[PDB]
Every structure is written in structure tokens, then in C-alpha cells.
């Protein structure tokens, strides 16, 4: 049932799927990156680089893209989200406190902004809201329109865009069997924060992917380290991802009730397999499945599966802290400092 590494899927993905989202489908112009490449067991994403170039290059990429779109206005399988190109350099910060304050008339919720100004490597959380501001995500109907607006009403083009940049990235949501899977295509068409242990309160098995990086040329360390991150735990991962495809997709005004419904049903069943979960907030998951309809459902679901991605991330960080002392006291204190760069 769950969605599980084969080599059946593999092939159906290379064979099915990839030749119809990838800008040029020449097994010899793309390569798998991350987790899939190294075939983890509990399939998260896709992500892929494309080489197009010279065969597509600035001055006829963007019909390529449009072409993209269009073949999959009847294909209910494949969505394109984002087509992640350009920059808005307004929200471009040099991180000084006067910096800053030229930005709020940009932006609607600042609070949250004061509310992290508090207090010198919490840049994390102004970039973590002005990320998806700076970098320019068009959706498909402001690629085919071929202009966007950015905030204060400032008019901008996407040719000119892929004339000023290199790389555009293609965000899809492909359904591969019972729900939504992620394939990010990164296209270039011209010719690293997580890894340290500093930046972590205490989220034990995200401290584990730091870990795993230090101990990436030791084998017998890093087949246990995989093991623990990718089998044992691999499902708590999953399980997250596959939250955050739900919120991403709706976000972004693209769920409908039929696709919400197969993710919380997918969820409901494999929650289940994981051990230290309040089972309470899928007994209320449940009852909105019950008397709520059409978007308050899918509403109300959003809000409980936050709560539930709070909870499965509890659990797993309780479960991993064994673990991680396990093998950081297997680096030298001297070295365990900043771990690992
Ligand atoms: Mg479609
Ligand atoms: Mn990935
Ligand atoms: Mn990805």
C-alpha cells in the first residue's frame, strides 16, 4: 500500500512520468539528485537537474515551458505549481537593523517578523518569511499571461527573467499511486545551513542528517546512520514530507476536496505504524471527515494536520536523541563543537 521504493516504480517514474515533465527527456541530459537517487525506501521526492542547453537556451525556453503547461491542462496525474524564476531584489536584506525597516511597507504581517527580532543567527526565521518573496515563484496561468505582479504593484516579466538568469525550477506534484509526490526539476538553460549542529535546539533526528554527513566515508557508521534515518525512522520522515505536500498545494490554491481526502485517508493508515503519537488528533481528524463539507473540510484538515506534524516531530526527535549521542560521542569533544564543516 504505502509508497515504497522498487525498481517496477523506478522504471514506471523514468519511463511514465519523467519523459512527460522534464524539459528535455534524453536520459543524458537530466540526473536524479537526493534521496531518490540513493533509492530510500520511503519515497519522499523527486528532484532532478536538467541540462537543456544548447538544445533550449534563452531565446526559446520559455515557449518549451508554456508547451510544458499546456500538455497538462487535461492531465488530472501532473501539476505544475511553481516555475521558480528571478529574484525581488527589494527584499534583498543586508540583515542591519536599518535594513530591515525599508522592507515593512512591504510587507502585511511584520508582527510575526518583531516577533522573532529577538534576538544574530535568527536570520533564519526573516529569511524563512521573506524566502518565497524574494525569489519569484510564477504559477502556470502568470507564465502563460508571460507577466507578473509583485508586491506594491510593481509589473514584471518572464522573459526578462529567464534573460537575467541561468536556471529555472519546475515545481510538479505528480499523483504516483494513492497520492501527490513532489518532482522538483532544476533547468539550466545557460552553459549546507543544516549541516551544522549549532543551528539545532534539539530536534534529535535532524541532528542525525549532520551526523551522517560527518561520517559519509566511514562505512560501517554511515550504513547504521542510513539505516536509523532512512528504515527505522523512515516513515516519521515520510509523513512529514507528505504534510507539507498538503499544505504546499493548498497554499497555493490548487487542493481540491478529492486530493485532500486521498492524502488524509493515505495518513490516517500509516500513523498508525508509528509509535508515540497522540491518536487523539486522528480520532478528531475523523470527526471533521464527518460533519464538516467541500472546503471547511479541507480547512479544518489543515489546521489538525499541524498540530499532528508538531506531534510526529516530538515523537521522532525523542525516539532519535539516543542515538545521536550514540555517535556524536564518537566525534572528539574539540570537533563535536561545530560539527561539520
Ligand atoms: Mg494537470
Ligand atoms: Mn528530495
Ligand atoms: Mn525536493
Redesign the pocket.
Same mark, same amino acid.
Given at each position: 500500500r504505502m509508497l515504497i521504493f522498487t525498481y517496477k516504480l523506478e522504471r514506471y517514474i523514468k519511463n511514465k512520468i519523467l519523459p512527460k515533465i522534464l524539459v528535455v527527456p534524453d536520459r543524458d541530459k537530466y540526473q536524479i539528485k537526493?534521496?531518490?537517487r540513493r533509492r530510500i525506501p520511503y519515497i519522499? /521526492?523527486? /528532484?532532478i537537474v536538467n541540462n537543456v542547453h544548447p538544445e533550449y537556451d534563452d531565446t526559446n525556453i520559455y515557449q518549451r515551458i508554456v508547451d510544458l503547461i499546456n500538455s497538462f491542462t487535461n492531465d488530472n496525474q501532473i501539476k505544475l505549481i511553481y516555475v521558480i524564476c528571478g529574484t525581488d531584489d527589494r527584499f534583498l536584506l543586508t540583515e542591519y537593523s536599518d535594513e530591515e525597516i525599508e522592507k515593512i511597507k512591504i510587507l502585511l504581517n511584520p508582527t510575526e517578523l518583531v516577533e522573532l527580532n529577538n534576538v544574530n543567527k535568527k536570520v533564519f526565521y526573516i529569511n524563512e518569511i521573506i524566502w518565497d518573496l524574494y525569489k519569484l515563484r510564477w504559477t502556470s496561468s502568470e507564465v502563460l499571461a508571460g507577466k507578473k505582479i509583485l508586491r506594491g504593484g510593481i509589473e514584471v516579466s518572464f522573459q526578462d527573467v529567464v534573460k537575467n538568469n541561468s536556471i529555472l525550477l519546475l515545481q510538479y506534484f505528480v499523483k504516483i499511486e494513492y497520492y501527490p509526490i513532489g518532482f /522538483?526539476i532544476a533547468v539550466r538553460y545557460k552553459p549546507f545551513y543544516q549541516l551544522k549542529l549549532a543551528n539545532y535546539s534539539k530536534e534529535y533526528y535532524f541532528m542525525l542528517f549532520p551526523l551522517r554527513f560527518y561520517f559519509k566515508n566511514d562505512p560501517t557508521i554511515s550504513k547504521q546512520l542510513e539505516y536509523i534515518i532512512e528504515t527505522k525512522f523512515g516513515l516519521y520522515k515520510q509523513l512529514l514530507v507528505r504534510i507539507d505536500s498538503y499544505r504546499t498545494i493548498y497554499e497555493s490554491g490548487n487542493l481540491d476536496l478529492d486530493t485532500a481526502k486521498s492524502i488524509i485517508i493515505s495518513i490516517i493508515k500509516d500513523i498508525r505504524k508509528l509509535n508515540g503519537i497522540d491518536m487523539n488528533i486522528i480520532d478528531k481528524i475523523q470527526e471533521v471527515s464527518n460533519n464538516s463539507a467541500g472546503q471547511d473540510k479541507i480547512i479544518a484538515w489543515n489546521t489538525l494536520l499541524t498540530q499532528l506534524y508538531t506531534n510526529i516531530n516530538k515523537s521522532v526527535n525523542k525516539q532519535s536523541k539516543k542515538y545521536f549521542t550514540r555517535y556524536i560521542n564518537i566525534i572528539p569533544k574539540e570537533d563535536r563543537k561545530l560539527c561539520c564543516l
Open positions: 537526493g534521496s531518490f519522499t /521526492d523527486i /528532484d /522538483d
